[PDB]
Amino acid sequence: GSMEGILDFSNDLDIALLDQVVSTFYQGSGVQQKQAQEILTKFQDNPDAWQKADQILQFSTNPQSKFIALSILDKLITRKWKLLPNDHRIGIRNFVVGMIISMCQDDEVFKTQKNLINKSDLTLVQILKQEWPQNWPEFIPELIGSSSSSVNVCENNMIVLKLLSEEVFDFSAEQMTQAKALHLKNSMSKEFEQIFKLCFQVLEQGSSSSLIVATLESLLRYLHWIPYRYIYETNILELLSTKFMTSPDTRAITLKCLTEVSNLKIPQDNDLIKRQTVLFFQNTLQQIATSVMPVTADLKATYANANGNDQSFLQDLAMFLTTYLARNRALLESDESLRELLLNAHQYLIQLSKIEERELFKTTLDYWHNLVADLFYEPLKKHIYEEICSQLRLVIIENMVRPEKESDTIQLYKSEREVLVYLTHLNVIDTEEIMISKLARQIDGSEWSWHNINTLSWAIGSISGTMSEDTEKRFVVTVIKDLLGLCEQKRGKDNKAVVASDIMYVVGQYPRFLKAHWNFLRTVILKLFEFMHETHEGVQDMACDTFIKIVQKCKYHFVIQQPRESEPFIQTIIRDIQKTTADLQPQQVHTFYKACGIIISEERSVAERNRLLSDLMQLPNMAWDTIVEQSTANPTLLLDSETVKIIANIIKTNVAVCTSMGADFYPQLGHIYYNMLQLYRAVSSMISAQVAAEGLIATKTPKVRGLRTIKKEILKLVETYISKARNLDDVVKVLVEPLLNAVLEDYMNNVPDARDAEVLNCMTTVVEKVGHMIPQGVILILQSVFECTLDMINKDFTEYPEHRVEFYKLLKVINEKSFAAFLELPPAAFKLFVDAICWAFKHNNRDVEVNGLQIALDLVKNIERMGNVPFANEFHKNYFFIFVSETFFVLTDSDHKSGFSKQALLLMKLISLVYDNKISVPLYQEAEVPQGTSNQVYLSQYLANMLSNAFPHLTSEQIASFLSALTKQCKDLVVFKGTLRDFLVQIKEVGGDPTDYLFAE
């Protein structure tokens, strides 16, 4: 169209055409906007566009156009500044300075073009980072001088100094070399005395609040790094904590400054500094009480109303109070004239803690944790805070969150529990009274609600283990009584459900009570069993979860014969298991069997444990024998979805029991093992037959997914047992060979879409646990899965994501436990192994990249361990520089920054091999270098050539200095990594200083 004319640089730039493109992008819509966007991006990226910024900035009447012109200049200054003729550098500086001056002198422009002025200020700072102070020593003196001739210029200078401070001290670590950052930090430190004088003068005298605010904004940045003397040996704390707290315009930034002051590095043996630290806190709290709100104010309501900047102010007040008090409250705790200040500050925090704002609550709660931990351990402190702590008990009990998917909520509950446990130790009587009182107002209906009875139940459950057993005893009884009467008194299943659940939750949290009151524990369990027949939504899930939770803690009381009982209760559970679980869904039945397996594993007499095990598995074992008789006499039955589902649930039941019994599960595994693997083969045939008759789409059908579920659950069962087995002779002699014969060929000879990644996961556990004992078995695993899996995943980074992850987990453990298996690979297959490792480097998927880098490191170590033998010598000749160059590639390509640390570790290992002369043969060819040349010399030569061709804009001196430093530092990972980071900075620009690489000296 017509808009594309600005992209034709052989002609003069039509400014009015630019402004139409810009307006269309920023103010337009739809297709017009989109087209203009792509034109602007092409314009901005033209490497000559900067030559036209001078024009745009003088003659455009569109601020967005000038902003884009400055973005263009920014790219040039930060990446190609030093390549320019010195005349352009001076020229660019001059018309940035001049444009800033002229915008500040025009009061209309100064007030209406803040965005453009801010961008120009930042562009100036980019030039300062290049030119100052070495080529601009007068910048600061002239800034200070020019500040006196105009309020606008003075205010804008505060913005420039703020951005400069940010660029030098807050954001330099990632963006500059170590040497350049230090150079700029020293330069600012050298001239800060002058800067502070101007800053303090403005604060003490000025009246323009826009100028005051800007000066305070810069001060906030300075407080990150300046010496504490500028703050404590001047009157500035007084100004901050009085004058600037009274005006709302300056109150927000001043509070942020005082928060950072509360973090200054300060000597703790100076009484006068301590008094100053007390004083500015006293002043600040005084101003809040008189100018903002008294300590009785309802901050919950204020925050909810959300007027003006109230929410940000209350957030900042919480940050100030918690920051200061976590560091300095001891200053206030001894002097009785400071006691009111100490408690008023904490009373504000109490009020702040009632605000409905999850993230703010976490901020105050972190502080409360700091406090109550100190009162728990520090002599003579807790009495000071008795009334604060009493209020805090109520705050936390009333904002308890759900303990048991929301991980933000899980963490918050644990934090709340920790604070409440401390608070219970600090005064166990007060805690009990609050909870019983809250309970009464659930019964009397004055605070009754679903949310409120749940909240209180979680709180009561959270303090288990803090009271004495006798107090806990009385307390538990009281709670259960009141809760039972509360359920009885409510109408409808909905109300009765909520209360019965809370009742079971509390009970599950007090195993100490259960362990000492068998008749009670027994009645509890039997009630849960009754609840497993209740069809009201959630009652059955609650019953099963409570059951296994109690069992995990009280299992011993189920396996012994209890006084006045005629058998261990586990026998009674088993006898009636069919009735008990008749109305449960499969998932819930499995939880029940898992809970039974926990109990059974506490029986240490083998004959009694195995008998309980066989009795527990009676129902699944009978269903199993049946189906093995049927599905064998007519393999078609397995197409019956109902039989497939029955089979899967049998296997899932075995998984559930094996999960809790581990090594003890072996007798049950032996009952089913051989027929289970035969079933694995039969299902495998059916899957293949279906794919043949219906095509790949068969794998999506419910029939085939049901069949594959059988395969996956069989694999999970074997993996679960082997990962916990204690008799590894039996694993090797009885389990492994049938397993491999059943799974490996089937995996290899299925089409890719029918291969189960779970096969790889199962094999990983086999190798992990008994790999050292089955060297021929490991070879067979590689032969059957290595090449065919690699071919699935080596065409892109996305297809077959699970196979990808499990593939490299398997290679990692084989490389760890049976490296000999890679030695047996034919040379072409070992080359694929190396290709596969490097392929893993290039993944952005963390679950692949990390294993790939660890395989590479482990492999280099394995080769080194072999000494001076032909396989190791050939390995280095074939693959050393492949690993060096591939590691360098991912280090420097800006798309694998997540792996920097492990890339650096691998590179340092590789380089240290050569400079420890641990590679015995020459790494070069006979011809390409004279005889006798050390590998050290050749490595430096190879790397110089590699970096010269990959980064042609670096000078030979840059490359040589970088490699000299990197080489020297290959025994010091932290410094090594610093040098790599410096290199990553320098490759982003032209003309990096080669002496930067001497930073570590």
């Binding site: 005893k473 009884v477 259960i480 009584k481 039972l484 009467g485 359920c487 009885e488 409808g492 299943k493 009765k496 459900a497 019965a500 009742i503 009151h517 008749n519 009670f520 009645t523 509890v524 039997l526 009630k527 609840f531 209740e534 009201h536 009652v539």
Partner: peptide, 16 residues
């Protein structure tokens, strides 16, 4: 100890 009234009331808990 036993606390038999807690047990009794527990045995009678009902969802409806």
């Amino acid at each position: 100890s036993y606390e038999a009234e807690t047990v009794s009331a527990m045995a009678l808990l009902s969802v409806g």
